[PDB]
Every structure is written in structure tokens, then in C-alpha cells.
Design a protein around this nucleic acid. Structure first.
Lengths: 105, 86, 122, 118, 50, 203
RNA sequence: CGCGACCUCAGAUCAGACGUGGCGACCCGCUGAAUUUAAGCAUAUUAGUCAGCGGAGGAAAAGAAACUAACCAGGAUUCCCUCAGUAACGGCGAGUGAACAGGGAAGAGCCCAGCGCCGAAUCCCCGCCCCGCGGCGGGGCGCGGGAAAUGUGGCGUACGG
């Protein structure tokens, strides 16, 4: 029963939501487990970089973002071809490779 | 006559001791346990009775062979070894 | 005489049995003393006899088993008693050798492209 | 070669015997119903003694699994005596009672003294 | 019933050996709270099921 | 190789030579039991495409499935609900008849592992499929690194969980805008993630 | 008729193996309501939810595009924040309701069939020898047996070879 003046609210609480409520009390424990696993990994590959292989420079699609630059998944095969790196060796020296990328420009 | 007088004629059991669940629910004429469905290979259990589940689950009995697995697990199920003699 | 299992393992087989039934006999007449209203001292002895029979039986079973699994040491098939019993799930896993099998193709990759050890400068 | 009958029957094929490459179990299980496990203890009740002097029998609490045949050869071997017949019943408490009638050449009254009951 | 089965007779044997009072000396034990047997079944009141 | 001819020949299921063989097989398969082992694949080409290799450990069962839809098993129609649910007749099963075949061949031979299946003929009342089984405890399968994945315990009864090629198609999963209702593992995985309040600590 | 192949198909307490049942919080595949809301009620809603059935694992499932996009373009799956209570659906009523881009967690890729080449170059099992032998494996020797040409293995898979 709407009172004098307000919004027409549509709360999506008509299902049995109380049975599927995900609480986040493990959040600080998860942040700890993640960090410990991150440091354990860095020690395992000790001299190699902690972040992982280099990623390529990449534009963003969708005109809202094409003025920015991201880190891609991996270097395209023609980028490796011009750089003189065999595509099956680049992963062994820490160069992310994905054969799906094309280069239009 | 449907009351007191008719309780006198009760001298034939329909159920007897099931030899799989031990409950007295083995229907004689149907040859089926109304508690575990004995002749059926699978145990009778339903989710519409949570209370009847926990009456008969893996922690209610002795676990005479499972409580040993829990103990052997915390050493990797080692076998054929003995502690070094004196 | 407090029968200790250290003292039984060096004895030959058929004389252990000669000692086994000897305790069997003594347990019987001790059980007879339990119904004929025997002394409290003898009644407390049947526990000593019961555990002494378990000891000699334990030695007999153990020495017999290790003679078997010494006879089945180098044989391919052995009775199910002597095979290692550990959680049926892991009796089904692949061997310590099968799971280490790599294809000739996959082996050729490791020889050609082994993972290098490197480091990037600042 | 002709078919005299209009029916076809599955021909008898050769079937071999088991020749296992290994025994399924290592060693035979030892008999847990030997002569000492059969006879638990005799009875010393007023009716049991009354049964000794009169009918020349002995009363035992045997194991519930034993037969009259196993009981007969047990007492025959444990006490070096001969038996006429054995009657057994299962007491209401659960254990099995056996009335062992000795052969007339043995006097059960003295036999009871060797084993201790009197 | 005089006509019994061995299953039944052995079952009635158990329920008969359980009907005894607790021995006197147990409530001389240290951590003993038991006062008496609370599972005493009387053949006329409680009918044992079956 | 000859397998290309046999492949392209089986793409002519209307030609006279194919229409003859199919009706001859479908006659013969109709005289056997609903589930019986075949000695060799009737389609050697299709078998190899799906993973069959002629070697000890690969088994092929040819089983028979009754065609048609699925009628609601309720006594005399009586669906005591709202009119939207009164349907009894024109209801369709959510899984293919080929997936029902893979299940029946896998439930009978529990010791084996279903690999794939293929169509070998049909009629007005029956569809016939040949399921490819593998015995995961044969040393020819156990010692081969290419196929020893089927031996792992996680692939017990692939057909009952809908992981075979024929079973996967009924789950409606794939990449793209056509398959949004199974982003995540499955159709239930999406539903959970979309109907779960993420009540954070600080909101 | 006889004899022998082969193909189909039987019988074995044949030699050696494997499956069944339980638990079921989490997971996968089906099946699947009605209370309820709509101030009545039939579509809708409740809800692909409860109940029912099957199958697992220590995680499962998913997964290396028959993708998203329309950009100067991104680049397997899963998870989180956001997109967004939005586009859309709906007796367009009650109500229902995603995705892409973007930021993070993590990050890993691969193999066949086919097409062809190589003298089947391949595999299982039995017997002997050596090595270890509670994950029965390694090597050798067998005019020892079998599988396999109705296709085993090596090379090789769309990034081309």
C-alpha cells in the first residue's frame, strides 16, 4: 500500500533468497590465502619475475575506451615473426603468446 | 463396535524384524521392509524426512572399519612397516 | 610363568601348539572352578590365562604369515591376504610407472623446448 | 547326419575345472570350534547332580553352534570316556545345555570328581 | 507362543538378560551418577514390541 | 585413403545403394536384442573420427531405442495443477535419443567407459546407435599415454553426467550470445550466481 | 559326405581383471509441483525452486572460439567489482531480467581422425634371465601364443603441414 509520495520500488525478493545468501566473512582469510600462495609462487620461480610473462600493448575496443591501452593476453605471431623469436621458444623465456590475435595496423 | 470390541481380534502381526535394518518393519505379505526396502539393493532414504536420515547414517553405528581408515589416513596408509625394534 | 611374546618367537611350531592346548586345558578347569564356588585367587587367574592364550595365538599367526609372504615374495600373483590393503579407491590408480609415461611426441617437446631460467633487469 | 527330432538343443560343450594361479586366501582359516571351544563348563545345579547319580549322565553348557555329533566327540576326547547318547536344548537365556549320557561301563559319579564338579 | 523361531528365541533371550537391576558396587565408583536401572521392562506393562 | 570414400559415401543416405544397405541392416538389427555387443564397428570411418582405435580394450555395443516423444507418466491424464501443466502428450524429452542410448549402454556395462556413439540406422519405431566403450583396466588402454585419461576416476560414467559428445548437446553450452543462460559451468551454475545475494562485509 | 579356413553366435566353478552398495555439505545430468503474489483468477508469478531419479570428485563442471565486436578493434574457461535493477520480457499488470566493453583474482595450453609417407616399423599374454620386488615394473632372450591391413605406431592438426 503506497503512502503519499515515493518511488515505485521493485525489490527482487520474491524467490527463496534467504537460502542462497553468500556472506563474505572469509574475505580476510581469502586475502591471506591469496597472498601466501602468491609469495609461495614467487619463491618457486625465484629469479624469474613474480608477475609472469610480459604482455603486449593493446588498444581497447568499443569507442568508449579506444583512447586507452591495456595489457593483452599475449603477443601475436607476426609480432614474434618480425622480432625473430620462434613461437615455441617465447613461452620458455617468459613471453606470452596467443595465436588468435591479428594485426590490422 | 468399531472401538474397544474390535481391538480384541488383533492377533496377527503384519511386520517382523527386518534382517537388514533390524527394525520391526518387514512386511510379511509384501516381503518388503517398510524402513529400508530390504529386497531392494538400495537403502530407502528420502529427503522429505531429514530427521529419519540422521537416525540412521554413517555416524550412528560403530564404524568398526571406517574409524580405522580415519586413523590410517593421518599417516598416508602406510603398510608393511613396523616401528624400529628396541 | 608370565608368558612373554619375546620368548615365543624363537620356538619351533609344533611345540607352541603343545603350549597352546596346555593353557586351553588350564582355562577349562579354571572355568569349572568358577561355577563350583572357587577361591577368589583362581577366579582372577582366568584373565591371565585368557590373555596368555591370545599371546601364543598371536605369535603363531604372525610367524605363519611372514613365512607366507616370504614364500610369495617374487611371485607375480599372490593371495588377496598378502596384497596391500589401502582404500580400494587407490588400489585402482595407475602405477608409479604408468603415470610417468609420456608420449614420444611429448618427450620431443621437453628436449627441444625446456623451460629456461631467466631474470629481467630493473 | 540327420535331425531326428524337430527341436534344437544347445550341444554339450567341454567345461574345465578351476586351476587358479594363486589361492584366493593365503592359508586355511583355523577351526574356531575345536574341542575346548565347544564345552564351556559343566553345571552344578541341584537338578544337575540329581541327573548324575540317577541317570549316569553329565550336564554341560556347550557352545550354541555345536551339534550332538561335535559334542559327543568332544567329551569323548576331553575326558577319555565313551558316550551313549547326547540330548541338547537351548536354555531361555541363550546358551545350549547338553545332557551327555555315559556308556554303562563308565560311572559318571567318579568322572564328575576328576573334572571337579561334585 | 510355544512355537518360536530361533531368531525370536535368541531375541527374547537378550531382553531377558537385560532386565536385571544394576549391581550394588557400581555407585561406589568415583564418577558415578547412576542411581538405578532406568530401562527395567516389566512383562505386563511394556510389551517389548514384536 | 579409402576412408574418405567411405565417409563421402555415407553422406548419400538417399541413394539407391545406401537406401538398400540401411533397410537391410535395420531389418537385421530389429531381430536381435535391444542391447547386444557388436564384434566390429559397422561404420569403421565414423568410429575412428570419434576416437575408436582397433586394439584390445575397445568395445562396441549396438543398442536400440524406441523413437517418439515422452508422455507424462501420470494416471489417466490427471495432472492436478493449473491448466498450464495439463500437457500429457506433446511433451519432449530434454535429452536426445542418442544420449538415452549412451546411457543404457553405459548402465549395463558398468565396468566400461562410454566414449562416443553414432547413428547406424532407424525406422518408424526404432533408432539404432553403436556406442564405443573402453575397458579402463586393460593394459593396452592403461599403458597408453594418449588414452590413459579415460582411466582416471573423474570419468566414471560420463554418459550419466552428460559429458559425452551426444550428451553435451542437450546442455546448451557454448561460446557466444546464443548461450548466455549457461555462462559458468552449466545452466544451474548460471542460475545460482544470478540468484545469490552477495552480502559483503561492508555492503 | 569328409577336411580346413573365415564370418557370425553360444557354453564354461576356464586364466587374470573390473562393476554393484554407502555418504551426499559442495558438484554434474534429468524430472519437476502446489501453497503464494496478482487484494478474485485461468497466462504470468512462486520456479527450473521443494519433493523424486541417476553419477561423481577433493573439488566438480567449464575451457583453448563455427567468440565478442564495428573499435585506431579485442582474444580459452572460471571467480569478484561494475555494467544494472539496465536492454529486454510481461492479463506491458503483478512482476521478471541478462550480456559486451572496463578493473581485478588466476593464467597454460594441447591431442587425434582425416590427408599422406615409412617392409606393422605397433600392442597384449605366456616361458626363461637379470634388476628391484607392500603402486609387479625395467632390460634381455624365445621359428612361443594372440590382437592388428575392416588399420597398430612414428611424423603431423588449421597458429598451417
Amino acid at each position: 500500500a503506497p503512502s503519499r509520495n515515493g518511488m515505485i520500488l521493485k525489490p527482487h525478493f520474491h524467490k527463496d533468497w534467504q537460502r542462497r545468501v553468500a556472506t563474505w566473512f572469509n574475505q580476510p582469510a581469502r586475502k591471506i590465502r591469496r597472498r601466501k600462495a602468491r609469495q609461495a609462487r614467487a619463491r618457486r620461480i625465484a629469479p624469474r619475475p613474480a608477475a609472469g610473462p610480459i604482455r603486449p600493448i593493446v588498444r581497447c575496443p568499443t569507442v568508449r575506451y579506444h583512447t586507452k591501452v591495456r595489457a593483452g593476453r599475449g603477443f601475436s605471431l607476426e609480432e614474434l615473426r618480425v622480432a625473430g623469436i620462434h613461437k615455441k621458444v617465447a613461452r620458455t623465456i617468459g613471453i606470452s603468446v596467443d595465436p588468435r590475435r591479428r594485426n590490422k595496423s | 463396535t468399531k472401538g474397544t470390541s474390535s481391538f480384541g481380534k488383533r492377533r496377527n502381526k503384519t511386520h517382523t524384524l527386518c534382517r537388514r535394518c533390524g527394525s520391526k518393519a518387514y512386511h510379511l505379505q509384501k516381503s518388503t521392509c517398510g524402513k529400508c526396502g530390504y529386497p531392494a539393493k538400495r537403502k530407502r532414504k528420502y529427503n522429505w524426512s531429514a530427521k529419519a536420515k540422521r537416525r540412521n547414517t554413517t555416524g550412528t553405528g560403530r564404524m568398526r572399519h571406517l574409524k580405522i581408515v580415519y586413523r590410517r589416513f593421518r599417516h598416508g596408509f602406510r603398510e608393511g612397516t613396523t616401528p624400529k625394534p628396541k | 610363568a608370565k608368558i612373554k611374546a619375546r620368548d615365543l618367537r624363537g620356538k619351533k611350531k609344533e611345540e607352541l601348539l603343545k603350549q597352546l592346548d596346555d593353557l586351553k586345558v588350564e582355562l577349562s578347569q579354571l572355568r569349572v572352578a568358577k561355577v563350583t564356588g572357587g577361591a577368589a585367587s583362581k577366579l582372577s587367574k582366568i584373565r591371565v590365562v585368557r590373555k596368555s592364550i591370545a599371546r601364543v595365538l598371536t605369535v603363531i599367526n604372525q610367524t605363519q604369515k611372514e613365512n607366507l609372504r616370504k614364500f610369495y615374495k617374487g611371485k607375480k600373483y599372490k593371495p588377496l591376504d598378502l596384497r596391500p590393503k589401502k582404500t580400494r579407491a587407490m588400489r585402482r590408480r595407475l602405477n608409479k610407472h604408468e603415470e610417468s609415461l609420456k608420449t614420444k611426441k611429448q618427450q620431443r617437446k621437453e628436449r627441444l623446448y625446456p623451460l629456461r631460467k631467466y631474470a629481467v633487469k630493473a | 547326419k540327420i535331425r531326428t527330432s524337430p527341436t534344437f538343443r544347445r550341444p554339450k560343450t567341454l567345461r574345465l575345472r578351476r586351476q587358479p594361479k594363486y589361492p584366493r586366501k593365503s592359508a586355511p582359516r583355523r577351526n574356531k570350534l575345536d574341542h575346548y571351544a565347544i564345552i564351556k563348563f559343566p553345571l552344578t545345579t541341584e537338578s544337575a547332580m540329581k541327573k548324575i547319580e540317577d541317570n549316569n549322565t553329565l550336564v554341560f553348557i556347550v557352545d550354541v553352534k555345536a551339534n550332538k555329533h561335535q559334542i559327543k566327540q568332544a567329551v569323548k576326547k576331553l575326558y577319555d570316556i565313551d558316550v551313549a547318547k547326547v540330548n541338547t536344548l537351548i536354555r531361555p537365556d541363550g546358551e545350549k545345555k547338553a545332557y551327555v549320557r555315559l556308556a554303562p561301563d563308565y560311572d559318571a559319579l567318579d568322572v564328575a570328581n576328576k573334572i571337579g564338579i561334585i | 507362543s510355544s512355537h518360536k523361531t530361533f531368531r525370536i528365541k535368541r531375541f527374547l533371550a537378550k531382553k531377558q538378560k537385560q532386565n536385571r537391576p544394576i549391581p550394588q558396587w557400581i555407585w561406589m565408583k568415583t564418577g558415578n551418577k547412576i542411581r538405578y536401572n532406568s530401562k527395567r521392562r516389566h512383562w505386563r506393562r511394556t510389551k517389548l514390541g514384536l | 585413403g579409402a576412408y574418405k570414400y567411405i565417409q563421402e559415401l555415407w553422406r548419400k543416405k538417399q541413394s539407391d545403394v545406401m537406401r538398400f544397405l540401411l533397410r537391410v541392416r535395420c531389418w537385421q538389427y530389429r531381430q536381435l536384442s535391444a542391447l547386444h555387443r557388436a564384434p566390429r564397428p559397422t561404420r569403421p570411418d565414423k568410429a575412428r573420427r570419434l576416437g575408436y582405435k582397433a586394439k584390445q580394450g575397445y568395445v562396441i555395443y549396438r543398442i536400440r531405442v524406441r523413437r517418439g516423444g515422452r508422455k507424462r507418466p501420470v494416471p489417466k491424464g490427471a495432472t492436478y495443477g493449473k491448466p498450464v501443466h495439463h500437457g500429457v502428450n506433446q511433451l519432449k524429452f530434454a535429452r536426445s535419443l542418442q544420449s538415452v542410448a549412451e546411457e543404457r549402454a553405459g548402465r549395463h556395462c558398468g565396468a566400461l567407459r562410454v566414449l562416443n556413439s553414432y547413428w547406424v540406422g532407424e525406422d518408424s519405431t526404432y533408432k539404432f546407435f553403436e556406442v564405443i566403450l573402453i575397458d579402463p583396466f586393460h593394459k593396452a588402454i592403461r599403458r597408453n599415454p594418449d588414452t590413459q585419461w579415460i582411466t582416471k576416476p573423474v570419468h566414471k560414467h560420463r554418459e550419466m553426467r552428460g559429458l559425452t559428445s551426444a550428451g553435451r548437446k542437450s546442455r546448451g553450452l557454448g561460446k557466444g550470445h546464443k548461450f548466455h543462460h549457461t555462462i559458468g559451468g552449466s545452466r544451474r551454475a548460471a542460475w545460482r550466481r544470478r540468484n545469490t545475494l552477495q552480502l559483503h562485509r561492508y555492503r
